[PDB]
């Protein structure tokens, strides 16, 4: 959860480097049009076993069902992780939060 | 604006104030009429009641005048001033305004009032108004200032004030600290101050604790130990509830 002045991207940058290498880590900032591609990124990196990070989810609140739906679907590989950035937004879906 | 310029300010205030009072009154008369009698809410009075129960007076009013967030606290202030003002005016028509002690709590645009003396002094002194500079002094009355003021009900937080010095506040002490009235006015640049340059420390004079905006800032007796006051975050708030 971000607060004003909070940026974890740098810590993660470092952890990506530290606990992994190889540029397996890939990332996406939410915005216009990204959502369709994010699915692919997710799908691909999940399948690969690489680390994927997604930012500013609070902006795109309507998405989330589609996302969480796909999350219950998607098949992990050991060493695959999902990293998520969110300002405080209500109406943010409880399912994924769970 | 009348021939004498200070007064011009106060008559202005008189008017603009009353204008607000009556805007408020109308936004009050409206909502006063739906509850007891026959009216249909417009989006206006629909927006009025939203203000009350959000506990924040309306952007409608706060656009006109930056007042306290609490709507009642707003009114009490608005009103108390309105009347005081009529008293100021009275003392002013008679050219008698200087002579009393005036708290700046009352004014909506107190800064502007201050800057209004700046004219009247230069009128008396026949000087380019850019030439003057402003100060106050607790250690007596300003000699070189053609006109002055006695300002009371100033108030302070974070440091304590005794004549000629400031001190540290102890735990017990209420955050709020009453301050002794000033003598204020306008005086030549490159003329001798009331205080030497280095002893006094400038402090803001905020409209409230929120302290969004400032009326002015005043130089005040350091008594050495400059940083501690700053870290103390000492500041002056002109008035509360007025």
């Amino acid at each position: 959860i971000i607060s004003p002045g909070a940026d974890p991207s740098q810590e993660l940058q470092e952890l990506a480097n530290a606990e992994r290498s190889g540029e397996c880590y890939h990332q996406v900032a939410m915005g216009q049009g990204q959502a369709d591609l994010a699915i692919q990124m997710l799908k691909e990196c999940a399948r690969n076993g690489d680390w994927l990070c997604l930012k500013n989810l609070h902006l795109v609140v309507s998405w989330l069902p589609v996302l969480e739906k796909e999350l219950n679907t998607l098949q992990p590989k050991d060493t695959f992780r999902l990293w998520l950035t969110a300002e405080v937004h209500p109406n943010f879906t409880p399912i994924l939060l769970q | 604006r009348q021939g004498s310029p200070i007064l011009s300010f106060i008559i202005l205030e008189q008017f603009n104030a009353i204008r607000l009072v009556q805007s408020v009154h109308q936004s009050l008369a409206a909502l006063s009429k739906v509850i007891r009698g026959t009216t249909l809410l417009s989006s206006e009075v629909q927006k009025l009641a939203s203000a009350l129960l959000n506990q924040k007076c309306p952007l409608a009013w706060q656009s006109k005048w930056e007042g306290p967030e609490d709507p009642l606290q707003y009114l009490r202030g608005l009103v108390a001033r309105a009347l005081a003002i009529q008293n100021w005016v009275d003392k002013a028509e008679k050219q008698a305004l200087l002579s009393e002690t005036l708290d700046l709590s009352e004014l909506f645009h107190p800064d502007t009032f201050l800057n209004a003396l700046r004219q009247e002094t230069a009128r008396a002194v026949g000087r380019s108004v850019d030439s003057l500079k402003f100060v106050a002094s607790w250690k007596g009355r300003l000699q070189e200032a053609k006109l002055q003021i006695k300002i009371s009900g100033l108030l302070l937080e974070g440091c304590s004030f005794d004549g000629n010095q400031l001190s540290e506040n102890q735990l017990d002490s209420p955050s709020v600290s009453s301050v002794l009235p000033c003598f204020m006015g306008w005086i030549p640049q490159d003329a001798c101050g009331p205080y030497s340059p280095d002893e006094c420390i400038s402090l803001p004079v905020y409209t409230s604790a929120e302290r969004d905006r400032v009326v002015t800032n005043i130089d005040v007796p350091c008594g050495g130990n400059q940083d501690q006051w700053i870290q103390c975050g000492a500041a002056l708030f002109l008035k509360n509830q007025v």
């Binding site: 219950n72 879906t93 409880p94 399912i95 769970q98 | -």
Partner: protein, 48 residues
Amino acid sequence: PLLRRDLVAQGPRYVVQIGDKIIDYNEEFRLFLSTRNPNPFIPPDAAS
């Protein structure tokens, strides 16, 4: 239309509305359904 017994009589058998599609309602048909989240959602329209 499915949740209501919104069935129309076509001779002996009963046909049912789904989108544009009209289907014979097989009388042995029963339905049940689930969700991971309490709400959302239902309208009072749907509660009944």
